[PDB]
Every structure is written in structure tokens, then in C-alpha cells.
Amino acid sequence: MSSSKRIAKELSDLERDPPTSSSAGPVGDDLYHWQASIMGPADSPYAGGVFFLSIHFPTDYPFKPPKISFTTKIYHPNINANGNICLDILKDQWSPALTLSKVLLSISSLLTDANPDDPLVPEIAHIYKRPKYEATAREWTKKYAV
Amino acid sequence: ITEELHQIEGVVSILENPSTPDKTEEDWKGIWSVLKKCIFHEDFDVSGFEFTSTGLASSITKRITSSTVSHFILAKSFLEVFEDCIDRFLEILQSALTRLENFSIVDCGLHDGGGVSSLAKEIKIKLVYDGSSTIVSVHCIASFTSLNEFDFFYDNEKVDMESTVFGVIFNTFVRRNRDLKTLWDDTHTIKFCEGKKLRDFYKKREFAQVDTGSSADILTLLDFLHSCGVKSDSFINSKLSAKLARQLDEPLVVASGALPDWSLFLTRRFPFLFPFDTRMLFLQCTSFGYGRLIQLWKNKSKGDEALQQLGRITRRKLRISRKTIFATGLKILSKYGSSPDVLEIEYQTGLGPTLEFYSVVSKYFARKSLNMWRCNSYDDYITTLLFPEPLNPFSNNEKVIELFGYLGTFVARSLLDNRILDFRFSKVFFELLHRMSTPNVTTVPSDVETCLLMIELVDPLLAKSLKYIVANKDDNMTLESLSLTFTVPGNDDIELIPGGCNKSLNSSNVEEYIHGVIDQILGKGIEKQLKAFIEGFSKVFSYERMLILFPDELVDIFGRVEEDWSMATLYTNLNAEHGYTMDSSIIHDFISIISAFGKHERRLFLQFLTGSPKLPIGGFKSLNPKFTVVLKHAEDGLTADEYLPSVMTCANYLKLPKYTSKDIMRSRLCQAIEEGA
């Protein structure tokens, strides 16, 4: 029931109860590095996109939060080019009771309603604050997310 | 005045009466509140002498010394009420101690005082072999080894061979309350029948306890108040501090190791009563003593023939190669760790190479290849606060422990030889080092909350998760969801208790789990390393002498290095995008503003930016998020001049508005940083 078994139990949770749209899993035989395939909501401006995330768990996997990094480049005020995500959950609202099946859902909701008050790339926040939706999402979604 | 005199007797009775509840924190808060109500009247405070004449000091001293509640509970209960009147209550105690102070300046019988002339004041000594006689004008500093090449007895009292001439005669005369002026008058006649270090001038008097009379209650109250964790606003006793400064001002008594027991006991036991420089001078006088004390007083005097003939410290060359600098320096440090001589490091002159050595090895001890300190666990040097990691009971931990002992010897050798180091020790490291070397106190505080707040200065994420566990120790389903085993977080190879690798964590054994984690991080897990550090440190001079400092104050004496804030380094380690360019006028102005700052300005701005008092080792370049200035755009229909810059630092970001002028920008910066205090 250790940290490695914490990851194993998380994997079992994912296996027996797969998510409706945002699937994920480990990479190779190694248990630490993972892969996530989240899909933007159909009603969302990021609709129809498959995104790959490189998840790197820390040594004390249930205590310190995991590293979530975007590999599929996307255009969003709260997402940088290297995949770093500035979200409250991964920094201060973190509890060992927060499973990965919750953090991926948090990212799923973030991709719908952005966080302009706390932007990572400011100019996109400036644009967001009607054609902003299209010029922000559509072209990047078509040329990268598909 | 009856209402302000007789009611204090009733309060004293209430404190003395055991019928008063004093178990929970609420009851102690209530009694603190009623004490504050009594002591502080509607016109003026209780005067210093009135406080002890009614026994109130003892009345509360006994209740804070004979109650069975945790120190954390008492400290919280007190600071919940007295946080706004710390000095208003400190003035009373300081006045009472000033009135009841009776400790005596044990001087050499005036003789112009402890001035410049008090250096070579010689004394007459007539040696007689009692088993043969010579009369020699003996210097007050020469020891019975440096003078009498045969044990010694003065006034039928055995004399240690390592002591000086004065160290026995002066104590003999003082202990019987003889006259303090006849010493220069009486021709005292003695009856008798590797560079050694004359640091034994306190090793035989470590427990030199002397009673404080009626002031014991006041001293206990001061110690408890200081241990409550409040600032150092008014803990310094002006009378006592001045008296101690006067005592240290006399060089002849100190150079003979004849310090009065009250000074040693007060410094060791109550270190909050004296200014920092006074305590550092006390450490300088007591720790290395004669060889370096002669030159320490000579330096003050120059701002003499006897001093220059009897205080010559030779120097030993140390030559090391830059390839094997770390290892060779460590082995030479082991070989000459406690040699009293002055050691200068030479690369294969003067202060240059040795300062470079003391800097680079202090950098090296902070790397990850040695597995000495805990790491980020995700550029060999560690950036964050540096703190030991739990050992492996099975793995060969010989090299880690040996290196830790080397670290202790290195730190002591640096502190003795007035050198400057670069470490970023966590204050908790030294707090536990102190609690270990202090007698009759557990290295790990008994109370849980103190341990949690002690690890919160080490790994804030670890501490907040552990506090989540503790706060949710009564919801079993939550513990099942956590689903962890009895092994130390961050290293699954070590278990809390043997056979617990498969032991589930739930409400049944939550407390055992917390105790195991705490003992594995702070206590048993790092006990071997701390003890090795203490042994290496005390190889040169005892670590007990360093109890006169504080945890937070001797972090700085090791983290003292002139950082580089030159324009070139700032430029090469600055980023400007999302509105700004690297060669922008405002960016150049910002760099010019920053790089000309003083001492405290740098620290205040750095605390405002990152939250740390100072930047990690190596300068700005070591700030891994690579400090960046982002043009804070002007919105909301108002000019950027009125806008105040906001941190919003995710990693190293600084939202800098495009101010219309340089000086308005500097004014806004100076405004914002102060409210960032």
C-alpha cells in the first residue's frame, strides 16, 4: 500500500472505471511517467481536440503534487509553450486526497472556462478581456489538436 | 493605592492556590487575562519593585514551572493576550530585575579600570617550593605550564596544571569574600610539591551554577516569555548588558580564565539579556582565549610590549590543488581541525586563496552527489534551504557520517578564524543541534504541534500534507483513501517500524504513523548525522558555547558573503518579454535602480519578490526560474503611474507597469516593497 502501490491503486481505479472522454495511463513498464489523452468539450471553443500530457510523479507521489506538462502545443492564456500549467490545485489547494482522476477533470474544466485573472501569457488574457475565441482556439486546434 | 496593592495579594493567592484550573489552554488564557488586568491599571503600570515585593513574580513562576501542560499550549495561550503588550510587560520585568540585580563586577581591583592601561598591569608573585624560593614579577597571563614548566595548592586548594597564575589566586580571594584591592598589595606565595590549546578556561566550570536570589522568578518569566517566540524588542537588560560589557572590558581577569560564575551562567542559560555584539565578544573571550584574545584586545587598543611578546600566533601553510580541492581540504581539515594556529589556504596569497577555499567548499557541501542533504527529488548544487535527509539503517552510511563530521569541523574552524561562509542552513538544523546539546531536553520536542511547525520550515508541502493527516485522523475512510504504508515519505526504502512495509495506515495507528514520520525526519532518522556534526564541531571547541546565540542569528553569521549585483550579471540573468524588450529604456532604468541599492534594500526587495530573505547560492543565475520582468499592461482607463506593481510571481515574474517616468516608477517600487514587509 506504499507510494508505488498508491500509483498502482490509482491505475486500478482508472482501469476499472475509465473516464468518459479524458483517458490516461502510464508509459511503458515504468510506473512513474504517464500519458494522458484529454479531449476538449464539444460545446467548448477547443472542441474536437486530442491533447497529450506528460505526467511525471514526484518521489513522494501522494504527498507532493504531480508534474503535469502539455506536449501538444495549444493556445490558451493559462498554458505556456513548455506545458507548464498555473492552476491552484497543483500549488496550494493540493491534498493527498486529490487523485489524478480529479486533476485531469480540473484541467478539463479549465480548458472550458479560462483563468484570465491569473494568466501565464498576458497578451492572450488581454485579448480575452468575440473573434478572440476563434483567433485563440480554432486555428491552433485545427493545425495541432487534430 | 490599596486597590493597587492589596488586590495583588489576592491575585498571588489565586496563583498559589491549586484550586485554580491550569490544565487546558483556555484556563491558562483566562489566568493570563486576569494577570494582565491586575498588573496593568487604568493610570500606570505596576512599578518594578512592587512586582516582587508582593511575591507575584514567584506566584506566576511556580504555576508556569509546576504545571503539566505542553510548552506549545502555554506559549499560544500567552501570546493570544499579550501579543499587543509585549514591551509593556517587558518593561516591568526589566525594571524588577534592574532593582533586584546584585551580581558583582569581579574586577582586578579597579587600577584605572579596564582601559588601555589595564593590559600590561603586572603583579608580584613569590614562588616557594613547599616540600626552593624565588620572587619574580609574574605576568597575570602566564600559566602554570608556561611559567612553572609538580601539582599546585593555593590556600590548601588543588590547582589544575593548565590554569594560569591568576585563575587560582583570584578565585581563592573572591570565594572567601576577601578584599578586592589587596591583590596588588599581597605578594601571594604558592605552596607546591601539537600545539596545546588553552581553552580549558571553561571546560571545568560548565555547570558553574550560582543562585540569582529573589530574581529567580523574574528570570524564569523572562525565559518563558522569550521561549514563547516573540521578537527581541526589549529582552536586553540595559543595566545587566552594560555590566557584562564592563566585565568583558577588563582584559586581565578574562585572559586568566577567572570569569565570574554569574556571567557564564547567565550567558549560557539566559542569552536574550545581552546585545548580539556583546554575546559575540563573550564567545570570542571564552572560546579560543589567550592566543587570539591578546590580539583581539590589541586590535581594540590600536584604535603593548608584553602583548606583542606574549601573543604571537604563528601561521601554518596549507597548499591544495584545484582538481582535488574538496577532498584535500577536507582531509587537511581533519588533520588540523583543532590546531590553535592560524591556517591559510594556498592554491597549487593572504586572504585571497583562503577566502576562495572557504567559499567553494561551502558551495560543494551543498551538492547532490554526496546524498548529504534532502533534495528536491524530481546543476549539482542544491538551491533551497539545506537540511539533512534520513539515513538508511542497512546501507553503508559511513561516508555520509564522515562527511557530516567534516562539515562540523569545517564550520567550527571557520567561525573561530573569523571567516565567511556561503551555506544556507535551515534554522531548524541549528535548533535541533541546540536542543541536542542542551542537557535534560529531548532533541525532538515532546509536543506534536512544535514538531509540525519545525518541519514546516523544512519541507512546506510535507508539513501541510502531514497536517492534513493529523487534522483528518478521525475519518477512517479518508485514511483508507490515502492508502499509505509505514515508510518515510520521499524514500520508500526505509520503514517507520520494522515489518511495517505492508502496514496499512488508518485511524487505528495514525498517531504511531505521525510519531514515526517525525522521528524519522527530525529525530532518529537524522540523529546519527547531528551527533557526528556535534562531534566534529566540538573537536575544535565545544558546541555548548554556541548556545549563547539563537537559531535565527547564527544562520546569518554563516550566510555572510558579499553577493554580486553588478550591471553585467544582472543583465545576463534578466528576462523581459510579453511587452518588454531586453534593451528597453525602462528595463535599463530598473536595473540601474536595483544594482545601486544598499544592504537592507536588497533583502527587502528579494523578500518581496520571492519570499526568501536572500537569493540562493551563486547569485541571480542560480535562481532557476530565471528572474523575468514582464510589462504590466495599463488597463482600466487609468494611467500606469498610479498603478502599483503586483508580484503575481508564478515562478520569477515581476509585473512592471510602463511608467511614464523613471522616478515615479522608483517611487512606486519603494512604496510597494515596504508594504511587502
CSV table of N, CA and C in Angstrom, one decimal, chain B residues 176-243:
chain,number,residue,atom,x,y,z
B,176,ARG,N,36.1,33.6,49.4
B,176,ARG,CA,36.1,33.8,50.9
B,176,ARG,C,35.7,35.3,51.2
B,177,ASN,N,35.3,36.0,50.2
B,177,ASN,CA,34.9,37.4,50.3
B,177,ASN,C,36.0,38.3,50.9
B,178,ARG,N,37.2,38.0,50.5
B,178,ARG,CA,38.3,38.8,50.9
B,178,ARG,C,38.3,40.2,50.2
B,179,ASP,N,39.2,41.1,50.6
B,179,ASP,CA,39.2,42.4,49.9
B,179,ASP,C,39.6,42.3,48.5
B,180,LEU,N,38.9,43.1,47.6
B,180,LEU,CA,39.2,43.1,46.2
B,180,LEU,C,40.3,44.1,45.8
B,181,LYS,N,41.0,44.7,46.8
B,181,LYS,CA,42.1,45.6,46.5
B,181,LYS,C,43.4,45.1,47.0
B,182,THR,N,43.5,44.1,47.8
B,182,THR,CA,44.7,43.6,48.4
B,182,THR,C,45.5,42.7,47.4
B,183,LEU,N,44.9,42.4,46.2
B,183,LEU,CA,45.6,41.5,45.3
B,183,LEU,C,46.9,42.1,44.8
B,184,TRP,N,46.9,43.4,44.4
B,184,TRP,CA,48.1,44.1,44.0
B,184,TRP,C,49.0,44.4,45.2
B,185,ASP,N,48.5,44.2,46.4
B,185,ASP,CA,49.2,44.5,47.7
B,185,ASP,C,49.9,43.3,48.3
B,186,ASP,N,49.2,42.2,48.3
B,186,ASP,CA,49.8,41.0,48.9
B,186,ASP,C,50.7,40.3,47.9
B,187,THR,N,51.9,39.9,48.3
B,187,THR,CA,52.8,39.1,47.5
B,187,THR,C,52.4,37.7,47.7
B,188,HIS,N,51.5,37.2,46.9
B,188,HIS,CA,50.9,35.9,47.1
B,188,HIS,C,51.9,34.8,46.8
B,189,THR,N,52.1,33.9,47.9
B,189,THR,CA,53.2,32.9,47.8
B,189,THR,C,52.5,31.5,47.7
B,190,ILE,N,53.0,30.7,46.8
B,190,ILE,CA,52.3,29.5,46.4
B,190,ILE,C,53.1,28.3,47.0
B,191,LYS,N,52.4,27.4,47.6
B,191,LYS,CA,52.9,26.2,48.2
B,191,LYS,C,52.7,25.0,47.2
B,192,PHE,N,53.7,24.3,46.9
B,192,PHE,CA,53.6,23.2,45.9
B,192,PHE,C,54.6,22.1,46.2
B,193,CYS,N,54.4,20.9,45.7
B,193,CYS,CA,55.3,19.8,45.8
B,193,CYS,C,55.6,19.2,44.5
B,194,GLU,N,52.1,18.8,18.9
B,194,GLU,CA,50.9,19.5,18.7
B,194,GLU,C,50.8,20.7,19.6
B,195,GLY,N,50.2,21.8,19.1
B,195,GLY,CA,50.1,23.0,20.0
B,195,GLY,C,48.9,22.8,20.9
B,196,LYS,N,49.2,22.7,22.2
B,196,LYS,CA,48.1,22.5,23.2
B,196,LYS,C,47.3,23.8,23.2
B,197,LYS,N,46.0,23.6,23.4
B,197,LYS,CA,45.0,24.7,23.3
B,197,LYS,C,44.6,25.1,24.7
B,198,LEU,N,44.8,26.3,25.1
B,198,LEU,CA,44.4,26.8,26.4
B,198,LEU,C,43.0,27.2,26.5
B,199,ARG,N,42.1,26.3,26.0
B,199,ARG,CA,40.7,26.6,26.0
B,199,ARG,C,40.0,25.9,27.2
B,200,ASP,N,40.7,25.4,28.2
B,200,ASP,CA,40.2,24.8,29.4
B,200,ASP,C,39.7,25.8,30.4
B,201,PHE,N,39.6,27.0,30.0
B,201,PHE,CA,39.2,28.1,30.9
B,201,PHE,C,37.7,28.1,31.1
B,202,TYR,N,36.9,27.2,30.5
B,202,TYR,CA,35.5,26.9,30.9
B,202,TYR,C,35.2,25.4,31.0
B,203,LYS,N,36.0,24.5,30.5
B,203,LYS,CA,35.7,23.1,30.4
B,203,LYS,C,35.4,22.5,31.8
B,204,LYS,N,36.1,23.1,32.8
B,204,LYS,CA,35.9,22.6,34.2
B,204,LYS,C,34.8,23.3,35.0
B,205,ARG,N,34.2,24.4,34.3
B,205,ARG,CA,33.2,25.2,35.0
B,205,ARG,C,31.9,25.2,34.2
B,206,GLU,N,31.7,24.2,33.4
B,206,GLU,CA,30.5,24.2,32.5
B,206,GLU,C,29.2,24.3,33.3
B,207,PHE,N,29.2,23.6,34.5
B,207,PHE,CA,28.0,23.7,35.4
B,207,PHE,C,28.2,24.6,36.5
B,208,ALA,N,28.9,25.7,36.3
B,208,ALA,CA,29.1,26.7,37.4
B,208,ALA,C,27.8,27.5,37.7
B,209,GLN,N,26.9,26.8,38.4
B,209,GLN,CA,25.6,27.4,38.7
B,209,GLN,C,25.7,28.3,39.9
B,210,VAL,N,25.1,29.5,39.9
B,210,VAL,CA,25.1,30.4,41.0
B,210,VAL,C,23.6,31.0,41.1
B,211,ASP,N,23.1,31.0,42.4
B,211,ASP,CA,21.8,31.4,42.6
B,211,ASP,C,21.6,32.9,42.3
B,212,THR,N,20.4,33.3,41.8
B,212,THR,CA,20.1,34.7,41.5
B,212,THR,C,19.3,35.4,42.6
B,213,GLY,N,19.2,34.8,43.8
B,213,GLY,CA,18.5,35.5,44.8
B,213,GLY,C,17.0,35.5,44.5
B,214,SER,N,16.4,36.7,44.9
B,214,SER,CA,14.9,36.8,44.6
B,214,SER,C,14.6,37.0,43.2
B,215,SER,N,15.6,37.2,42.3
B,215,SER,CA,15.4,37.5,40.9
B,215,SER,C,15.1,36.2,40.1
B,216,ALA,N,15.1,35.0,40.7
B,216,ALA,CA,14.9,33.8,40.0
B,216,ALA,C,13.5,33.8,39.3
B,217,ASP,N,12.5,34.3,40.0
B,217,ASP,CA,11.2,34.3,39.4
B,217,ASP,C,11.1,35.2,38.2
B,218,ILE,N,11.8,36.4,38.3
B,218,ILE,CA,11.8,37.3,37.2
B,218,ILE,C,12.6,36.7,36.0
B,219,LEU,N,13.7,36.0,36.3
B,219,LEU,CA,14.5,35.4,35.2
B,219,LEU,C,13.7,34.3,34.6
B,220,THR,N,12.9,33.5,35.4
B,220,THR,CA,12.1,32.4,34.8
B,220,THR,C,11.0,33.0,33.9
B,221,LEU,N,10.4,34.1,34.3
B,221,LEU,CA,9.4,34.7,33.5
B,221,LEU,C,10.0,35.3,32.2
B,222,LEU,N,11.2,35.8,32.3
B,222,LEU,CA,11.8,36.3,31.0
B,222,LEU,C,12.2,35.2,30.1
B,223,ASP,N,12.6,34.0,30.6
B,223,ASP,CA,13.0,32.9,29.8
B,223,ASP,C,11.7,32.3,29.1
B,224,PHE,N,10.6,32.2,29.9
B,224,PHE,CA,9.4,31.7,29.3
B,224,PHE,C,8.9,32.7,28.2
B,225,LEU,N,8.9,34.0,28.5
B,225,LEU,CA,8.5,35.0,27.5
B,225,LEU,C,9.3,34.9,26.2
B,226,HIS,N,10.6,34.7,26.4
B,226,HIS,CA,11.5,34.6,25.2
B,226,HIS,C,11.2,33.3,24.4
B,227,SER,N,11.0,32.2,25.2
B,227,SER,CA,10.7,31.0,24.5
B,227,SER,C,9.3,30.9,23.9
B,228,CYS,N,8.4,31.9,24.2
B,228,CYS,CA,7.1,32.0,23.5
B,228,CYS,C,7.3,32.4,22.1
B,229,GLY,N,8.5,32.8,21.7
B,229,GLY,CA,8.8,33.1,20.3
B,229,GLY,C,8.6,34.5,19.8
B,230,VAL,N,8.4,35.4,20.7
B,230,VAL,CA,8.2,36.8,20.3
B,230,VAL,C,9.6,37.4,20.0
B,231,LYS,N,9.5,38.6,19.4
B,231,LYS,CA,10.7,39.3,18.9
B,231,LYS,C,11.6,39.7,20.0
B,232,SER,N,12.7,40.3,19.6
B,232,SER,CA,13.8,40.7,20.6
B,232,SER,C,13.7,42.2,20.9
B,233,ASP,N,12.5,42.7,21.1
B,233,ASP,CA,12.3,44.1,21.2
B,233,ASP,C,13.0,44.7,22.5
B,234,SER,N,12.7,44.1,23.6
B,234,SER,CA,13.1,44.6,24.9
B,234,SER,C,13.6,43.5,25.9
B,235,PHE,N,14.2,42.4,25.3
B,235,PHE,CA,14.8,41.4,26.2
B,235,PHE,C,16.1,41.8,26.7
B,236,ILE,N,16.8,42.8,26.1
B,236,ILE,CA,18.1,43.3,26.5
B,236,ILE,C,17.9,44.1,27.8
B,237,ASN,N,18.7,43.7,28.8
B,237,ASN,CA,18.7,44.4,30.1
B,237,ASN,C,19.8,45.4,30.1
B,238,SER,N,19.5,46.7,30.0
B,238,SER,CA,20.5,47.7,29.8
B,238,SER,C,21.5,47.7,31.0
B,239,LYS,N,21.0,47.6,32.2
B,239,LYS,CA,21.9,47.5,33.4
B,239,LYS,C,22.8,46.3,33.3
B,240,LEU,N,22.2,45.1,33.1
B,240,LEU,CA,23.0,43.9,33.1
B,240,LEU,C,23.9,43.8,31.8
B,241,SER,N,23.4,44.2,30.7
B,241,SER,CA,24.2,44.2,29.5
B,241,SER,C,25.4,45.2,29.7
B,242,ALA,N,25.2,46.4,30.2
B,242,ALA,CA,26.3,47.3,30.5
B,242,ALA,C,27.3,46.7,31.4
B,243,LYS,N,26.8,46.0,32.5
B,243,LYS,CA,27.7,45.4,33.5
B,243,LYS,C,28.5,44.3,32.8
